[PDB]
């Protein structure tokens, strides 16, 4: 139902001269773009990654980002000079920017900045601001970023207008991929005893995995984290810590949307 579109920028500055910026773009849990430092252009990772943008609008939008990437890079380097010796290299900067799409024509945009792996700055309303817990020295960079009216107007446009527009078109173009159903396949195994139910290849992410003795759910079931497969499906395991000899009669039941109420039921 709700989809979050995230442009994730990761920039490393090792010293005064060396730096690199790499970005990836996600719609929900599907990757839509990749922009490597080695590449002059943003790459589509889906056939539909241009959304409903005409070639002309795409080219214009990419060109703005191309100039941004060069500009950002020099700006950081100059902000370091400005703050020195308070802050030194190496420096990691991350941006998470995009919009979450709600039903109707509702959405919310965000632009969050992390410095050395800590969220410190956001764009909000019409200006950059530091968030709570951020160090005071950032007040100077904020003052300097906020002096740039042209950047402020452009970001306001990107966040308020461009993002929701783009994303709506991406959701229409990517519809069949977004709504894809791929079936989980399950298998069982054991270690010192401890039983594992492996569930792999399912899409989308929501899933139900429980150990059962007949119809009684085993409360000790421990769902692990969702782990990605390389083909944009998901992997998940559920463990049950049991006494040796008491395996017989235990089953792993999997419910997933792709199965149409035909649950996987695997008996040990």
């Amino acid at each position, epitope marked *: 139902k709700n989809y979050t579109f995230r442009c994730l920028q990761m920039s490393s500055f090792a010293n005064r001269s060396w730096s690199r910026t790499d970005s990836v773009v996600w719609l929900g849990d599907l990757q839509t773009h990749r922009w490597s430092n080695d590449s002059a252009t943003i790459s589509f990772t889906k056939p539909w990654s241009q959304g409903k943008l005409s070639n002309q609008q795409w080219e214009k939008l990419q060109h703005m980002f191309q*100039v941004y990437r*060069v*500009s950002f890079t*020099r*700006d950081i380097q*100059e*902000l370091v*000079k*400005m703050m*020195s010796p308070k802050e030194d290299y190496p420096i990691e900067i991350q941006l998470s920017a995009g919009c979450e799409m709600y039903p109707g024509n509702a959405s919310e945009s965000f632009l969050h900045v992390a410095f050395q792996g800590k969220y410190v700055v956001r764009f909000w309303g019409t200006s950059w601001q530091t968030v709570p817990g951020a160090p005071s020295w950032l007040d100077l960079p904020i*003052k*300097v*970023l906020n*002096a*740039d*009216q*042209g*950047t402020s107007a452009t970001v306001q446009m990107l966040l308020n207008d461009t993002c929701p527009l783009f994303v709506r078109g991406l959701l229409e173009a990517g519809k069949s991929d977004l709504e894809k159903q791929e079936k989980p396949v399950a298998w069982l195994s054991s270690v010192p005893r401890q039983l594992v139910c492996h569930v792999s290849g399912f899409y989308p992410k929501p899933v139900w995995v429980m150990w059962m003795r007949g119809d009684q759910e085993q409360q000790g079931t421990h769902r692990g984290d969702f782990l990605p497969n390389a083909d944009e499906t998901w992997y998940l395991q559920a463990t049950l810590d049991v006494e040796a000899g008491e395996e017989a009669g235990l089953a792993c039941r999997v419910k997933h949307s792709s199965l149409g109420g035909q649950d996987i039921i695997l008996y040990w």
Partner: T-cell receptor
Amino acid sequence: AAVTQSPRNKVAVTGGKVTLSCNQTNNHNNMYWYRQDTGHGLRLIHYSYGAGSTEKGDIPDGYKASRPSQENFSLILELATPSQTSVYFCASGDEGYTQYFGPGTRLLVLE
Amino acid sequence: TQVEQSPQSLVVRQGENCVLQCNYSVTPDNHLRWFKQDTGKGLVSLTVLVDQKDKTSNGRYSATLDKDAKHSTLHITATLLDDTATYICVVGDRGSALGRLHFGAGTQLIVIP
């Protein structure tokens, strides 16, 4: 918002030390030194984002910069050469893009 | 050399208008400023243009900026002797102190009284 420079004119010898001084009472964090030569636009030599900070510009070679205080930014030629014959402009600014230029200093370095 | 001015120099008679041109490759181009510099003197700001398509005026000076074409003109209406000077086009690549200024080498105007 005013910027001053001293001296306004200097005749120096090759190998001599020359200091070009720039003063600014606007409480501007940022100061800039340039030279202007015929056939070229102003070119950035050194700049400063605040006291005790100096940064190399595009043509730093043969010049040291000094920012002992918010008010003062010096351009120091330790071993003057005829190639440093030029007009030197200091400028200052705050966080905005405007640079406020001083009136210029004419240097001639004779052999 | 990312900022080019034309003509290099021109001679006009008092009361004539003239047009000076600035073309640049500077990226990004936040703003474009025109300076007047009398011989032996400092830089006097005549105007700054900031918009994609922009027009300004300041007495007998008017200027245009077209950021798509990366082209600005400075017009002087009804020249006077004191317009004898070098006119310098400067493009700032940021809208803040993080910017560098890129100077054209100037156009020399002589106005015959």
